[PDB]
Paper text:
The mitochondrial ATP synthase is a membrane protein complex that generates most of the ATP in eukaryotic cells. The translocation of protons through the membrane-bound Fo part, mediated by subunit a, drives the rotation of a membrane-embedded c-ring and the attached central stalk, which together form the rotor. The torque of the rotor against the stator subunits induces conformational changes in the (αβ)3 headpiece, thereby triggering catalysis. To reveal how the mitochondrial ATP synthase is modulated by lipids and organised into a dimer shaping discoid cristae in Euglenozoan mitochondria, we determined the structure of the ATP synthase dimer from E. gracilis.
Symmetry expansion of the pseudo-C2-symmetric dimer particles was used to classify individual F1/c-ring monomers into rotational states 1, 2 and 3 and resolve structures at 3.0- to 3.9 Å resolution. The E. gracilis F1/cring maps of rotational states 1 and 2 showed strong density for IF1, but weak density in rotational state 3. Subsequent focused classification of the IF1 binding site suggested complete inhibitor binding for rotational states 1 and 2, whereas rotational state 3 displayed a mixed occupancy, with a minority (34%) of particles containing IF1 and a majority (66%) not containing the inhibitor. Unlike the bovine ATP synthase, which displays a nearly equal particle distribution among the three rotational states, rotational state-3 (20%) is less populated than rotational states 1 (44%) and 2 (36%). Rather than reflecting dwell times during rotary catalysis, the distribution of rotational states is likely dictated by accessibility of the respective catalytic interfaces to IF1 binding, which for rotational state-3 may be sterically hindered by the proximity to the peripheral stalk. We observe this contact in all three rotational states, which provides the first observation of an interaction between the peripheral and central stalk in the ATP synthase. The position of the lumenal H5EG1 on the c-ring β-barrel remains largely unchanged in all three rotational states, suggesting a mechanism of transient rotor-stator interaction during c-ring rotation.
Numbering used by the authors:
A (entry chain G): 3 to 255
B (entry chain E), F (entry chain F), H (entry chain D): 379 to 501
C (entry chain B): 283 to 562
D (entry chain H): 17 to 176
E (entry chain I): 2 to 67
G (entry chain C): 283 to 422
Write the structure that this text describes.
């Protein structure tokens, strides 16, 4: 039985090569995680004022389907794997919240195939950003130029929030429609200023100062702050990709 | 025609064990992790308690008839039961006993949700 | 010959009781001369000696899919070819469980007839590419190449239990090598053949333009075996029989097949495909 | 099925925005500035004495408890003045200034670079590049030259 | 002017940023921030089985979406 | 020099199936993809049909001269033939027969293209 | 010596033809003594004995980069170091195709000259980091 | 109890050593970098010179008893000697004797301070 020992030796040497390969993925991952952790120290400041405009009370999902006509979802997935349950939990969330009037323009290569195979017709396409350069405001603007093609009524951005090295959870931004956001702003600017949800900030002086603001500038205010929201989604999912991959690498080892 | 399929599916699951133990479940196409979720169900369903091992498993022994075995595997093979969890197939005989085990598991899960609720409210 | 390993085990049981010296794996050592004395008697005699012959199809048991043992290596060393039956393919659903990349024949075209040469010369070139691509999970579900189509339909056609007449195989493989059976799906490839051999559709539905070429007479083998398909007087009739079989199938049967949703009829159709996989 | 195993938190909650009150007291003595480019801030809640913006309507200035307002930023320079009499200039690429009655500034921009890391020499070539683009009759290059000159001319006059 | 030409305010900001990154001196700041202006992404929409580029919106800033 | 260069290429080619089998072609530099293409082309180029194996292959063999066996390998070594596709090298003789095969594959490529157009217009 | 493994094969052929008792890999017992009778004659003698010296460079042929073979496992236990060559590197233009990780010289510095010690002290502290970097970095 | 606490300390320091390479030393809590400093003192404290090489290297060899070593390691674990620098524990023996090196290091540091101060004040 001189063959069985060669078969087992060959499997051993294969795994021995695979070990240094996964170790090379590990070190390459830490090379960009050390680069990207710097955002964590400079985190949670660029939307200190954006939320006061677009944030809302916890809306139900069964009501907006009846109010809306064509929803929209921006799930930000990844290009290459060994990440974890990120793309999987992001797919189980959409099928968990699936509904007839929806459409998905995602990001990342895994939402190319997974969404098309679990979501036959609702999914349309995706965007792919080669990670040779850090993301830019212009990339989020390219994402808004993709979203504007659809006459969407509410855009739910989904991404991965990095709370810590051992905490890469989900997170979302609920974006109303521009016309509907302006109607909510006009309806709110009249009545008395009262918060309808705990932890929600008052915004009446802002909604009136914006009420004086002309049309083109308010449209730039909306596309701007939605661009920052999208960009924060990308930077947070990028950090979550480089944060959970190391765990799904050391477990492979 | 049922047993020929059953052998085939486990044959694929064996090929995927070399990868899942390397990478994991999440690194597979939706077809593959489906076939895994179905083959884990089958292989767990292959077990049953015998009347002799009541001392060991502490469970009453079942006598699975031939016709109900083929109707169960054929139903499990065509995806007639995919929403059912994995553990409901463990150490049982007959699909009716499976769905009663699933009912017990769902009942206990809901009961622990009410219990964690009341434990949080009192706490 | 059934298991020759048992013909060596008996030789071992004798020599060792006779106080002969063992060797590798407890055999006497000269077992290679045993199998050579047996198998080199297999031959094709010269016309001086009547032009007779005798083929040998010895069978050798294997343990854990190894070809490293002593006896298996001494026998493969002698025999021209070998038909490797992999349990990983047997248990994989397909039967007979031959692994073509591991199994070879050191005769080639000079054995088979004029008609099978032109087919197998394409099938080898087909599998050479399919074996390289079939490891890929099919993602080009419509952009799948013709090779990924034909190779899989060809593997489905290989599924059998009993033997098939020569005539009833060349047409079935000609349908694939030219791409006629690329529109239907993979599962129904054998039922397509079951009609192509036993239920001539154009004879039933009146699409009778072929003068002679029909798959009921069953003696056209003796012409295919002589002239071959790639000929003046059989190519066009063959094309104007297969294109009709494809049209009648894709229009009458496939249209019904995709329209089934009931589990009671689904199971019935699945068992029908399995029956056609067995009887053919 | 499972009753909605997942519950993604609304990410807006992670930020702690102000509660702009109508004011039942006095005004602070110094603005609390918070400058932010694309995602990362350069200045987070620093006490500052004054700030001077460039907008489309014109050039504005701000002090503590300035009237509640929100507006664009023209592509140009931004001047800042601490309580210590010193100054800090930042070249910017558009943005939105968010001034409050409480006295708070949230200037969200695309880019924010100090003057120290800029050379007039490299700007010089880009000037005539922008002029040639503007003079080149083409809608694809004319407006690009008009915008390039729109961003160089403030720098051209700020450097001189 | 540039507004009615069809370009957006976001393309306007990105163009201005792309111009500002050119003039600033060479150092670690530019060495990092050029990443914030380089265009390297793309778009794809899945066919039945094949990949194809949804080129209805160009990534370059000079062009106009249509 | 040509023989040692090629062997060094193939020596790295093995170390690239170590990686490509796990990650993919996408995780490699263009200078790595180039040597991969060259090496894989060498691996298929060095094949040859023989007139004795006409029974097996059904294809005519080529008698390749030594001198012609150097300016073709070195050509592949310095990118003289990188636009040429992969399968033009498999089971052929000199570089003349390579380009003769590439013209044929491109001819049947335009064949499948015009037949696709005619099938789209016709149906 | 080019080479000892065929010397052992001959000793095997003789003992087995002489009906001597075999052992592992059909070698007799004293093959480790067969080599230790030889290699230990290699030495640096004393000034009382002429200061002579006999350096031995025994060659042994591995098979598929195995070292657990009986002969190689014994000769390594005898010698004052080894040199391990790799055909994976002989093909890659690294000629000689040494393998610095597995190669050992128990006489590290005391043999070398005054000019070499300062150099090798740097080269060890260069290749020690080269291997870690080339091993962890990607290929490209 | 001392030995097994040193074992748990060194094992924990090995884990934190396998985490610092990922996050950074500052990422750790106040208690974690405490035990990291203690482990860095312990592993240096395990280093002992020898009376053998005293002629070769010059340093003296210390024959430490058992009971004295226990009281030393127990002190090094109880936190009542943490202000001492790390390098003092390198290549010495006995807690009564390391402080001679610590004081010698503090005095030599104060000497270099006074030397730099007078060197700068003179000029």
């Amino acid at each position: 039985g001189g063959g069985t020992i060669r078969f087992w030796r060959e499997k051993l040497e294969g795994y021995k090569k695979y070990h240094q390969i996964v170790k090379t993925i590990k070190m390459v991952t830490l090379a960009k995680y050390r680069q990207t952790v710097v955002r964590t120290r400079v985190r949670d400041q660029t939307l200190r004022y954006t939320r006061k405009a677009l944030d809302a009370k916890t809306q139900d999902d069964q009501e907006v389907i009846e109010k809306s006509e064509c929803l929209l979802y921006v799930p930000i997935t990844t290009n290459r794997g060994s990440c974890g349950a990120l793309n999987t939990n992001m797919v189980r969330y959409l099928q968990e919240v699936e509904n007839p009037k929806m459409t998905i323009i995602s990001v990342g290569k895994k939402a190319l195939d997974a969404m098309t195979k679990v979501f036959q017709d609702t999914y349309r396409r995706t965007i792919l950003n080669d990670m040779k350069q850090a993301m830019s405001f212009q990339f989020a603007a390219y994402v808004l130029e993709h979203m504007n093609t659809v006459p969407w009524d509410r855009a739910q951005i989904v991404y991965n929030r990095y709370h810590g090295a051992a905490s890469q959870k989900l997170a979302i931004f609920n974006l109303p429609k521009f016309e509907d956001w302006k109607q909510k702003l006009e309806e709110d600017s009249a009545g008395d200023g009262k918060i309808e949800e705990d932890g929600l900030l008052q915004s009446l002086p802002m909604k009136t100062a914006l009420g004086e603001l002309e049309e083109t500038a308010v449209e730039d205010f909306y596309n701007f702050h939605s661009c920052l929201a999208v960009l924060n989604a990308v930077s947070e999912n990028e950090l979550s990709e480089y944060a959970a991959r190391i765990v799904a690498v050391e477990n492979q080892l | 025609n049922v047993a020929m399929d059953i052998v085939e599916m486990l044959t694929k699951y064996k090929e995927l064990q070399d990868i899942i133990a390397v990478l994991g479940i999440d690194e597979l196409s939706e077809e593959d992790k489906l076939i895994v979720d179905r083959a884990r169900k089958v292989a767990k369903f292959m077990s049953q308690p015998f009347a002799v091992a009541e001392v060991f498993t502490g469970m009453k022994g079942y006598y699975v008839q031939l016709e109900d075995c083929v109707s169960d595997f054929g139903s499990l093979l065509m995806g007639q039961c995919d929403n059912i969890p994995e553990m409901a197939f463990y150490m049982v005989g007959g699909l009716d006993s499976v769905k009663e085990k699933a009912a017990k598991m769902a009942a206990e899960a809901a009961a622990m949700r009410e219990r964690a609720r009341k434990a949080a409210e009192a706490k | 010959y059934d298991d020759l390993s048992k013909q060596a085990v008996s030789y071992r049981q004798i020599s060792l009781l006779l106080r002969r010296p063992p060797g590798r794996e407890a055999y006497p050592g000269d077992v290679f001369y045993l199998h050579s004395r047996l198998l080199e008697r297999s031959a094709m005699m010269s016309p001086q000696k009547g032009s007779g012959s005798l083929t040998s199809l010895p069978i050798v048991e294997t343990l854990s899919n190894d070809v490293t043992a002593y006896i298996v290596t001494n026998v493969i060393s002698i025999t021209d070819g070998q038909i490797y039956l992999d349990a990983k393919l047997f248990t994989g659903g397909q039967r007979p469980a031959v692994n073509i990349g591991l199994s070879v024949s050191r005769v080639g075209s000079s054995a088979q007839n004029k008609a099978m040469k032109k087919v197998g010369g394409a099938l080898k070139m087909l599998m050479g590419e399919y074996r390289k691509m079939a490891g890929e999970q099919t993602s080009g579900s419509q952009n799948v190449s013709p090779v990924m189509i034909r190779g899989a339909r060809c593997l489905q056609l290989f599924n059998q239990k009993g033997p098939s007449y020569f005539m009833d195989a060349i047409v079935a493989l000609y349908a694939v090598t030219n791409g006629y059976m690329d529109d239907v799906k993979l599962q129904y490839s054998k039922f397509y053949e079951f009609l192509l051999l036993n239920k001539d559709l154009p004879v039933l539905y009146g699409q009778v333009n072929n003068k002679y070429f029909y798959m009921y007479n069953k003696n056209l083998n003796y012409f295919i075996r002589y002239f071959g398909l790639n000929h003046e007087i059989l190519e066009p009739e063959l094309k104007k029989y297969i294109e009709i079989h494809t049209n009648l199938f894709l229009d009458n049967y496939q249209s019904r097949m995709n329209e089934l949703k009931s589990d009671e009829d689904l199971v019935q159709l699945k068992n029908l495909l399995y029956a056609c996989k067995r009887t053919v | 099925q499972d009753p909605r195993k997942f519950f993604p938190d609304n990410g807006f909650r992670f930020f702690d925005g102000p509660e702009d009150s109508f004011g039942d007291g006095n005004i602070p003595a110094q603005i609390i500035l918070t400058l932010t480019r694309q995602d990362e801030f350069i200045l987070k809640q620093e006490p500052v004495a004054a700030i001077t913006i460039r907008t489309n309507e014109g050039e504005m200035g701000v002090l503590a408890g300035h009237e509640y307002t929100v507006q664009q930023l023209a592509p140009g320079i931004l001047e800042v003045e601490y309580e210590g009499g010193k100054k800090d200039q930042y070249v910017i690429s558009g943005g939105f200034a968010h001034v409050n009655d409480t006295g708070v500034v949230d200037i969200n921009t695309v880019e924010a670079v100090p003057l120290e890391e800029i050379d007039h020499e490299k700007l010089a070539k880009a000037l005539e590049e922008a002029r040639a683009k503007s003079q080149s009759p083409d809608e694809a290059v004319r407006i690009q030259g008009e915008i390039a000159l729109e961003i160089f001319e403030p720098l051209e006059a700020a450097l001189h | 002017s540039w507004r009615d030409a069809g370009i957006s305010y976001l393309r306007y900001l990105s163009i201005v940023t792309r111009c500002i990154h050119e003039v600033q001196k060479e150092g670690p700041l530019l060495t990092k921030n050029v990443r914030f202006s380089t265009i390297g992404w793309k778009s794809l929409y899945l066919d039945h089985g094949a990949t194809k580029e949804y080129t209805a919106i160009p990534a370059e800033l000079e062009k106009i979406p249509e």
